[PDB]
């Protein structure tokens, strides 16, 4: 019954691996909310439309690289439900960017439990390919949101109009 | 509160396509099992898992072209949950097959009674739509898996052993 | 015993297909005899046969198109007798474009009933393929062969003599 | 008298035709009208005046199309007076695009009724042509000028001053 | 109330300005009516249809040259009804071909009565630009459409039939 | 009456051609028949469909060589019905490649019946013709379909089910 390529790879952290898939493509379903929103006739911000649709694309190949290292271990993935996103419309660019952040955040809070269960467990591989492939980018997602954030509350969004507009042409728009 | 762009755009309607893109997404979820599925190192069929990794892209971007079209119109985009797949472990090369051909006659369905809906409230643009993109690729999609399904039963699969191994390799591996 | 790709394909529009394929089949052979008459050594019009020898081969591509269609819908194709052209010998350029016109005024009068009964069968992928590869250019060649007669009628063939001579030089013959 | 190349079109729709062209020339005329106006010495917003300029030659390229319809069906084309367009000073950006999408939802308008009036004379390839060359990019029309009227007001046009100037560079000025 | 642009320009020559834009417009007006008839499937003189559709462009960039001018001199422009064409059936090659002629003369007739009012004001800058850009290609112009009327007439147009077909393809067609 | 340009041109060969002719275009109609069996979708052998295709093709251009031939030594071409094929479900792989073989032989036959009448007629040209165009790629034609025969018999067609798979993509998919 067991594979015959398992190898060092306790129970428990199957089991985290499917909770972190699950998470992913979740992420990857509220990017996709959040680009539908932008798009709208009377929101028209076209380049965050294009930003979060980018993030979203991002995301669902997070999750694809995760099904490889489940099968290359020989541990099973156990698909369930995506819950819808927690709201339809969204306000502002500001507010879209800060709970992006908040979600960012969460998806990072819980690669940091999955490598505090494999470190426990004495699995040195998925530990570094956590590291080398989530950690790091995660870190760099953040701070950039963060800096996004940052500027959009300087320049007097949501309040000043002419705020999104200009951010959405030269801090999006390349 | 109606939006500015809106014309001729029955709510019936706006109800049907919300739930025609809640129904590609399931689909593409789908997909991506049964490229899992393929990919597990006792099944072990590489170009069965490409096959369905990009049908699984493809209905994404029939989601997402339908996301467009609800925002052109002036209607407004309401996510539901993605259900998970109905099962997790396909069989065999031709029982995933025969699922996806099912799976894809029921999108097929759907989508004629989205047109029978737009004739019956004359909406010609939209109808026109669903008819240019939708109709014509799903016929195709569907002569395709059943030559496939035909060639794998004349094989001898599953029983035979090598006709998944041939078949991966002639017909999916170009 | 139905094929296991049938999907909304009525009887009665399986039956219509094969009668228009047919008609096509037998457009080709009439312009096929057409091209003969130019050829001949006391006619002696080689613009007017090449015309009518690609007109013929045009027409051998639209069976083979509806030929297809019956397939991807899993209808299945009736092949009947090809009738021999009502006449062997066309008297002069402007009768054989006066009868090609009538011809396929003809050919376009079967697809426009073909459209009514997918119409009042439901049958939207078949409409639109009619619509898209067969109205538009049944219209384009009709409206063509009609200036070819109007311009010949009007330089006075076929007593003038020359009238043919210099149409199949300047208009044919690029 | 009737034309040789006329076939299932109806006398109501002929006349249908001719009043959608006088429409579209109509059309052409207004947004010439404005683009002078965003070219006056105390208006003086280029990228304004090129992008009405430019919409201006693509409406005269509609009423050439349905120019090219009406003879290739066989009707014969009545030309009317092209009235002057309701005012000749438009006061600001913002005023100018809100009545060119008011505009352009009548064109729409007037196009859907041809529509319906050629589905119950049972004329498919006059549909067909209405749809694939009419009725999609006049969704794409408004769904645009929805767009630039939102960002407008948003910006604080007409009252700001600055917002014209940088929408003038921004998304007008590529 | 004045432009702060506008330095020696009469509100005489303001007026004739443009009546003569109003001129233009409806000269573009009778060449698209005449290329609608050269199309007419019992005409079909397609090289006719091409020679005016030309014209016509051309006569509709002589109106926008006209209200640049007024703009940079800083006129006002005020746009009147473009009046349908006197006839809608021009009978033959020759026929249209006189017309156009007769239409030529008189548009030249008018900037000829524009350029003896700004003589008499003292505008020089206003009359250069007449001379340079008017009055030179409206003579070019006139002695062209001289030389056709003339070739057609020799032939034998309109009774001969074969003379416009010739004209057609030589003279017209490159 | 007899053409200018007939010389030493039997009645009895003339006539003995237009058999020929018919015999030809027959040939071409059974290998559209069997090429659209193939692409049945519970056949699916889509490399069998293209080679009978090809087939059909070339079939068609054997009957125009000689409707030139008949042309060029002034005799009149006279077109009869083409009869529809034998049948219509043609089994398998295996079966359709021994009728198309049988087939091929008779057009043979009847080559060879024709070049003995040419030679006691005393007509060199006619059978220079002949043997140059027609008797020797009918020798290879029989040659390659029977070596198709022999292998697919040997593979075990049809009761092994992978041969027709196999031999459809190494001997006929290049
Ligand atoms: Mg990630
Ligand atoms: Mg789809
Ligand atoms: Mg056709
Ligand atoms: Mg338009
Ligand atoms: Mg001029
Ligand atoms: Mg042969």
Same mark, same amino acid.
């Given at each position: 019954?067991?594979?015959?390529?398992?190898?060092?790879?306790? *129970? $428990? /952290?199957?089991? /985290?691996?499917?909770?972190?898939?699950?998470?992913?493509?979740?992420?990857?379903?509220?990017?996709?909310?959040?680009?539908?929103?932008?798009?709208?006739?009377?929101?028209?911000?076209?380049?965050?439309?294009?930003?979060?649709?980018?993030?979203?694309?991002?995301?669902?190949? =997070? /999750?694809?690289?995760?099904?490889?290292?489940?099968? *290359?271990?020989?541990?099973?993935?156990?698909?369930? $439900?995506?819950?819808?996103?927690?709201? $339809?419309?969204?306000?502002?660019?500001?507010?879209?960017?800060?709970?992006?952040?908040?979600?960012?955040?969460?998806?990072?809070?819980?690669?940091?439990?999955?490598?505090?269960?494999?470190?426990?467990?004495?699995?040195?591989?998925?530990?570094?390919?956590?590291?080398?492939?989530?950690?790091?980018?995660?870190?760099?997602?953040?701070?950039?949101?963060? $800096? =996004?954030?940052?500027?959009?509350?300087?320049?007097?969004?949501?309040?000043?109009?002419?705020?999104?507009?200009?951010?959405?042409?030269?801090?999006?728009? =390349?």
């Amino acid at each position: 019954s067991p594979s015959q390529v398992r190898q060092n790879y306790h *129970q $428990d /952290a199957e089991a /985290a691996i499917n909770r972190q898939i699950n998470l992913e493509l979740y992420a990857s379903y509220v990017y996709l909310s959040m680009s539908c929103y932008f798009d709208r006739d009377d929101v028209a911000l076209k380049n965050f439309a294009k930003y979060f649709l980018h993030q979203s694309h991002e995301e669902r190949e =997070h /999750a694809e690289k995760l099904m490889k290292l489940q099968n *290359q271990r020989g541990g099973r993935i156990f698909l369930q $439900d995506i819950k819808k996103p927690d709201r $339809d419309d969204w306000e502002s660019g500001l507010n879209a960017m800060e709970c992006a952040l908040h979600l960012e955040k969460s998806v990072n809070q819980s690669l940091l439990e999955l490598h505090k269960l494999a470190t426990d467990k004495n699995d040195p591989h998925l530990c570094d390919f956590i590291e080398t492939y989530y950690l790091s980018e995660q870190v760099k997602s953040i701070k950039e949101l963060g $800096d =996004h954030v940052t500027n959009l509350r300087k320049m007097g969004a949501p309040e000043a109009g002419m705020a999104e507009y200009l951010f959405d042409k030269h801090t999006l728009g =390349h």
